[PDB]
């Protein structure tokens, strides 16, 4: 009984009935949280946190910052339910039946006596192996800092 499915069904409903910009912002948070939680379990815990620190902590509270400076103004129920029920029939984004319905395993090895976190490897590669990517990204962030001022600052 995967309770993750129910939450998305709710979000798949309020997205269709969203009326004002309050609803759309709440869609973003209600999309991030199923992303963050399903990543905290299952695949990668490091990036479940890296989402919260950057997505919610930087952009989403900047979404609601600007939205307060924008505006605040202002089929039925059977069609919305019918749309969801037909949309819910197929939910296999892939079509490799063998790859979906067969489970696998990996065999652990004791060679890596130097156990380290996944972030240490990323730092060990992003700062040495792919330093150019890091230095270009710094350059892009420099462009934005100069870019954001010129657009907004009237003088």
């Amino acid at each position: 009984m995967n309770l993750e499915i129910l939450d998305l069904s709710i979000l798949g409903f309020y997205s269709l009935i969203s009326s004002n910009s309050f609803e759309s912002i709440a869609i973003l948070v209600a999309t991030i949280m199923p992303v963050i939680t399903e990543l905290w379990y299952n695949y990668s815990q490091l990036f479940a946190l890296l989402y919260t620190l950057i997505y919610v902590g930087a952009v989403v509270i900047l979404f609601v910052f600007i939205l307060s400076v924008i505006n605040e103004k202002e089929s039925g129920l059977f069609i919305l339910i019918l749309v969801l029920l037909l949309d819910d029939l197929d939910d296999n984004e892939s079509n490799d039946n063998d790859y979906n319905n067969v489970y696998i395993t990996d065999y652990a090895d004791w060679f890596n006596n130097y156990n380290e976190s996944d972030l240490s490897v990323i730092g060990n590669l992003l700062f040495t192996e792919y330093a150019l990517l890091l230095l270009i990204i710094s350059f892009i962030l420099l462009m934005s800092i100069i870019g954001l001022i010129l657009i907004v600052k009237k003088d």
Binding site: T128, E129, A131, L132
Partner: protein
């Protein structure tokens, strides 16, 4: 094609600057004073304000020199680099490189130098800086490390060419030179 001897596929920053021919400094000399001149010449071609010649502000003559200085260095830096790669005349440089490499081997020291980088990082710093000069116009990057992926065979420094027998160099076999791949893995094949 006008190929020559491949001195160093990845010349070091300190060695590129060292091998600046007197013409190369002149190029740097022109670029450092050419930039203030070009700003003046532009006012000659068309003044910024009005219809009459007006020397640009002294403040601009200072920044333009800085642009020319860091601009004229790269023309010198690129000119020297082409002599290492073999794209430019390097008879003068080959004599200098072979003397220093032979001196390094004779003193039982590595031609490349001691390094603060573990064997992986030397390999990593080779790939980042090698051939970076082909983009030196777009953005700078230099080979400042003492790595060993210079794409040469060190035995080409053993045989004696014309006009070198006078230096009276004695060269030990490669398995006894400090800071080399062949003379580092003597106990564990995983660690230097």
């Amino acid at each position: 094609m006008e190929t020559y001897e491949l001195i160093d596929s990845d010349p070091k920053f300190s060695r590129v600057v060292r091998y600046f021919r007197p013409s190369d400094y002149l190029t740097w000399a022109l670029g450092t004073i050419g930039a203030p001149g070009l700003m003046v010449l532009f006012e000659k071609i068309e003044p910024a304000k009005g219809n009459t010649f007006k020397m640009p502000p002294p403040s601009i003559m200072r920044i333009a020199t800085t642009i020319g200085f860091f601009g004229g260095f790269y023309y010198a830096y690129t000119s020297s680099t082409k002599r290492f790669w073999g794209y430019s005349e390097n008879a003068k440089e080959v004599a200098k490189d072979r003397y220093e490499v032979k001196k390094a081997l004779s003193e039982k020291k590595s031609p490349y130098g001691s390094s603060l980088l573990n064997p992986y990082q030397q390999d990593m710093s080779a790939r980042n800086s090698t051939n970076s000069q082909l983009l030196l116009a777009i953005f700078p990057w230099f080979n400042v490390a003492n790595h060993q992926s210079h794409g040469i065979d060190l035995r080409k420094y053993y045989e004696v060419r014309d006009g070198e027998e006078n230096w009276n160099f004695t060269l030990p076999p490669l398995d006894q030179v400090k800071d080399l791949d062949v003379a580092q893995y003597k106990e564990y094949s995983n660690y230097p």
